[PDB]
Amino acid sequence: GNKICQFKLVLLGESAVGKSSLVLRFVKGQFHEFQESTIGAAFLTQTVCLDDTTVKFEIWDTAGQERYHSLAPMYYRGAQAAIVVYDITNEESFARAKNWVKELQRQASPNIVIALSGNKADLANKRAVDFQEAQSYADDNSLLFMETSAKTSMNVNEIFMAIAKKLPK
Ligand SMILES: Nc1nc2c(ncn2[C@@H]2O[C@H](COP(=O)(O)OP(=O)(O)O)[C@@H](O)[C@H]2O)c(=O)[nH]1
Numbered sequence: 001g002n003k004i005c006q007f008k009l010v011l012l013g014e015s016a017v018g019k020s021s022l023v024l025r026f027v028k029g030q031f032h033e034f035q036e037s038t039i040g041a042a043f044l045t046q047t048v049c050l051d052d053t054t055v056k057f058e059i060w061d062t063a064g065q066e067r068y069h070s071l072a073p074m075y076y077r078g079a080q081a082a083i084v085v086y087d088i089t090n091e092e093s094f095a096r097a098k099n100w101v102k103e104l105q106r107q108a109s110p111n112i113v114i115a116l117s118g119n120k121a122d123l124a125n126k127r128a129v130d131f132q133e134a135q136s137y138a139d140d141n142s143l144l145f146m147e148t149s150a151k152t153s154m155n156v157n158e159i160f161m162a163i164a165k166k167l168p169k
């Protein structure tokens, strides 16, 4: 019966890799508050309590701006965790993800916990990004890495749980 720590966590990745779907699937299976948004609904926020911990995430998600632009300094500000998502059936989304990571590390504090999500791992029959290639990049850059499926829920909870485990207290 002690102190809840709150951490801002931001979603990053090309349009259409499933960032929003991941947030929603995760949220669906945890205690959470009603979704909110910022002015003009430029960014969508949702608060969620991770089961059997005293970790509360304030998860930030975009409203699609990724397909046109970089993301604003406001989006990054305060983030203590990130999930950078790519689509395992799209090499391009993987190459791009590497750049979201660099952009992230440059904009965020040195102790941010970054997880790399190889999403749509349920389309294994259309895999275009090899697991060990992502894992090697992830290891070389101190990133947590898992393959996920927002659709089937595979590893959705556990990538959030993995992050929580690396966060302070
Ligand atoms: N098969 C499959 N489709 C997914 C998965 N995650 C997202 N999608 C689909 O990919 C499309 C784009 O998803 P969205 O969450 O909007 O991606 P975002 O633009 O990066 O937030 C939608 O049609 C989703 O239902 C997944 O894990 N598996």
Ligand SMILES: [Co+2]
Pocket (backbone or CB within 6 Å): 019, 020, 021, 061, 062, 063, 064
């Ligand atoms: Co989205």
